[PDB]
Amino acid sequence: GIAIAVGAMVDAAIVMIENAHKRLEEWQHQHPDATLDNKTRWQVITDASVEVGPALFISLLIITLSFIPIFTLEGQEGRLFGPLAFTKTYAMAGAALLAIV
Amino acid sequence: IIRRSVANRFLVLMGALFLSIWGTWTIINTPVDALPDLS
């Protein structure tokens, strides 16, 4: 369950990371290079994280919930795919809580 | 919501510095096996 969730859970951490780069790419072309501090740099980071943030959270939040139904599985086959569904759901629900905090 | 977490930015690190140390501990302790009991 973990091995499967990994690729999914990192990709939602990066979407913010490749983007902040771009909101730091923006301030470059706009203003002066070789100078910036915390106030402007952490705000552009906070800004970078909030516009495309929730949709990534919802994307991940949409992923975890959508897979849940395989908990519906019964008897023997369910005991098998039980832990696969938990661990996956935890990792997504893990990275999700991680991407925000 | 994200903006609250960044506020107390040290509470998230210290929280995290534990989520990893403690998790690492309960990772090395987690019992092994091949398949969830299926019987």
Added chain:
Amino acid sequence: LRHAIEAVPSLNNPQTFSEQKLDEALYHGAVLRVRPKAMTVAVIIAGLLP
């Protein structure tokens, strides 16, 4: 692309008989996003390959 369509051509719609106008936002909605887009599908499939 739903974002780049509100923002740039939203103001440039009142003109009737003007579709080539809107296509600009769509093209744009596909360029900056590819760097991320490829990169997610990149990992989504990358780490799911082993």
